[PDB]
Design a protein around this ligand. Structure first.
Ligand SMILES: N[C@@H](CCCC[NH3+])C(=O)O
Ligand SMILES: N[C@@H](CCCC[NH3+])C(=O)O
Ligand SMILES: [K+]
Ligand SMILES: [K+]
Ligand SMILES: [K+]
Ligand SMILES: [K+]
Lengths: 292, 292, 292, 292
């Protein structure tokens, strides 16, 4: 549910940019069969950025309908205005999602005290578990360990997706929070290292195309079998890097199409079609992973 | 109209967080009287991030009404989804604004090709002049000079607000565009240097509270009188820096209230009220400028 | 010998900046009694930067004489000209040191191929084990994992002091080198994390004043008892940070004087005496560690 | 003498790595004929890092001999130990150089107070004019404008080589120093912008191979003719960038050999011979400049 390999699932689209239900069903079945712990619906990799609030709700509800109770769903619910994050969250209360993934405000660069008031207010108006989401390269704001410590005292703020790739954050956060607070990597390339230092899992792009291997790697890491998990990570390392050779989710949607998991690799502007050179790098990564 | 001292005007609010019409009128009269060249309505400083699309439109329309033809008005119109930027823009067509300030997509970090396609599409769905806006510390995206060169070929893309504070960009962009493409600073502390290098004006935070000084500074710059302009810049330098002692527009709103230009210094979460230490810093800077 | 807690020992000085033998003897006895694995003589913390080549040799020989076979000594031997590093190394061949700590060329910023030719040539002209030393914040150059992989194939290049604080480097290097190559942290604040990911020890500033606790922490980390080692690291964390509140070794020399391990805290210009505010921060760290 | 186009001259070498007198003479005649204002002997570009103190002195003395009063000579004299900088400087007293270029201590990262004490002490042991040199990418140390202000009060500290490429530093430093303190760029690609902001010249890599163009560029700048200067700058921009395609002075030495100005392009390790791809890049840039 909030540990192990969690996929940040693509939002598959037809040629017009509308959600492809048939493609989504195939992905969801794939994750159920491959042992993925949960699905993050309309996260970053799900083009949270370019869906409107309504389309967003629809993809989440569709994922819940297709999932049919077989795999837990977490929805992306972040916003850069605290009133808007509260309002959006209300739409998912009692939807069937198990939790919300809520990103630090982007663009407006609030203070730490602002982040604290933001997240505390969101949490106050829902019974759903909240997972905080720190990704400074995208938002311009860095939610620091001291603030995560203050927010972890709020009953339903249950963990953090830490996407800095700065592995010192693991034990800085861990020492400030209770043993039940969940630490999840949001950086596939450093995620095994993150788990080895005491993290609990990963919210992953790679998992979209290597679900079984991600699931086994995370299970080995949780049991302490790091040498063994590292053999898997070494085969997935080209994917961990090359799925970001052009802006995510351009590479992963192309990989999903190439494997046949989705009908088209279409995305919404300002995301553009993968370049020829990108296709070649991604294909080589897929073959390194044994997927083609 | 697109040169000299352009104010990025605050959206003054009541204690409930909604626009205060009497305060806005007072500010706009103040800019008319001070010699400000134009007003950017619902830019970053105007809390574009925390107004919904309807509130945003209402503020722009109210600003045009109150300006009553005495001062040109440029609307913030950026979005991180191309479709939504086109909508937002279509909405101000025939409103009376003289142009749009359109920020690079934020959060989703598109490629340069993606930036080119986003702005080209927006420009194609309007007749209004477009000023590109590059502020990578907020967006996670850096619109490079090469791409500005490509976009400057589109008929109604007419300038750029360069808020990197990287002064080498002035002549990198000038080399690639025509003599009538406008270059404006988005960084108060470096704006005089930017104009000395060949830029044409500034979209300014400091102009909210030192409108006459800023207009006089820019007039001297445009005339080649840099040493006279620099005396004015040194008097304003503590404001140029300390209006960012806490996240913009927290300081400038406090300063506006302290000077009697607005009724309340209220902002929307996740922006937080100014700290005491903040108050003290900004008050010292206002004293140095001779404003209080 | 090349694992566990290794101290980067201060070079204690009298009021004129000359090496204080009596102070050095006290330190060396302290490390022998407290279980330190080895001593790095005239490393960074030993003011390698401001001793001339002769003074340098003398401090190393004095440390070896005082040590009297009771604890292994490693000498700092780096230089930014390959001919000079070869020449300096010859002076220590058969001195009694067990190894050399050789920093990447500083200031001149060579390519990776230049680093490879540099270190390979140094290694070629000695039988002494060489430990490579990467500290980009000081040198302007970053010795990358791929190059460390190529250098590890040289018979007597036996390990690396990795002082970036970037914990991803551990397993990037480890996967390219043999199981006998030693990975040592050169960043006290992240050193436990470094060991938890697969590093073998630390070349430490903190060890100068908390030798026994560092030695126990490293032993616990080597046995896999990370929770236990983390209790010690948490008590030493203020030191790990505040020994760098002013440039190293200013704080640690002051701490050593305050504890009575050395007669004076004098250093060589351009290092300056600790500030009052620095003394207060360092003292508080020492008390947190239980040392005062 | 301390304005206009100052060349940071290469130390041409034979195949063994020792100074080539005939090549040096040829370069110095070339600068006399081209209008270069002064020569920096054994600066960074002159391989200050890899010459020992005697070799360094020999090159400066040989340069003064060959210049034969026709062109002023400034010696590199920096060291990271204050005592050693004082020695090095005392050595050039009454040599015939007109001043010294003294870099911030490298590697040991002193405080600003430490920088103040280092340069003040050096200045006190000579009558030669001192030009401070700030190049943080190489040294790990950033000499800030405030500290430049303090040092500019010392009688014989007369200027600064600002190699950050951060153009805001020009007017930050000008505000704090007297009208006769000299500001020189250390960054070819930004040097014209630096002079347009109020700087007085450049210590240039590009001047090694485009001496006449650089002197003409600086003459036009000093006269206020920026648009004419910028035409010359655009012709040289590929050199300004591609003379750093591999670490300086690897490219400029190759270019000097290719133009017939020196006999060999030999450098000292850890600098390595230019790669083939490098050769091709620099040749294209020399073609663009009209030099070959
Ligand atoms: N700054 C905007 C977020 C854009 C929504 C993503 N397409 C707001 O406050 O709602
Ligand atoms: N750049 C110098 C190193 C200075 C020695 C430290 N005080 C050299 O090549 O030797
Ligand atoms: K909690
Ligand atoms: K245009
Ligand atoms: K080896
Ligand atoms: K002076």
């Amino acid at each position: 549910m909030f540990t192990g390999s969690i996929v940040a699932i693509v939002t598959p689209m037809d040629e017009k940019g509308n959600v492809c239900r048939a493609s989504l069903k195939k992905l969801i079945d794939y994750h159920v069969a491959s042992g993925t712990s949960a699905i993050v619906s309309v996260g970053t990799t799900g083009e949270w950025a370019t869906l409107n609030h309504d389309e967003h709700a629809d993809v989440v509800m569709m994922t819940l309908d297709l999932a049919d109770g077989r795999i837990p769903v977490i929805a992306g619910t972040g916003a850069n205005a605290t009133a808007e994050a509260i309002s959006l969250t209300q739409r998912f209360n009692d939807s069937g999602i198990v939790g919300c993934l809520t990103v630090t405000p982007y663009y407006n660069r609030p203070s730490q005290e602002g982040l604290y008031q933001h997240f505390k207010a969101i949490a106050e108006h829902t019974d759903l578990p909240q997972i905080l989401y720190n990704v400074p390269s995208r938002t311009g704001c860095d939610l620091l360990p001291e603030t995560v410590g203050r927010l972890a005292k709020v009953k339903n703020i249950i963990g953090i997706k830490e996407a800095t790739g700065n592995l010192t954050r693991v034990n800085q956060i861990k020492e400030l929070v209770s043993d039940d607070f969940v630490l999840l990597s949001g950086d596939d390339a450093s995620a095994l290292d993150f788990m080895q230092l005491g993290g609990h899992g990963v919210i992953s792009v790679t998992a979209n195309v290597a679900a079984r291997d991600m699931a086994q790697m995370c299970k080995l890491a949780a049991e302490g079998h790091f040498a063994e998990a590292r053999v898997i990570n070494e085969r997935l390392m080209p994917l961990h890097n090359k799925l970001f050779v052009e802006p995510n989710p351009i590479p992963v949607k192309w990989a999903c199409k190439e494997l046949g998991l989705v009908a088209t690799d279409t995305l919404r502007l300002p995301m553009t079609p993968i370049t020829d050179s990108g296709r070649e790098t991604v294909r080589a990564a897929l073959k390194h992973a044994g997927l083609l």
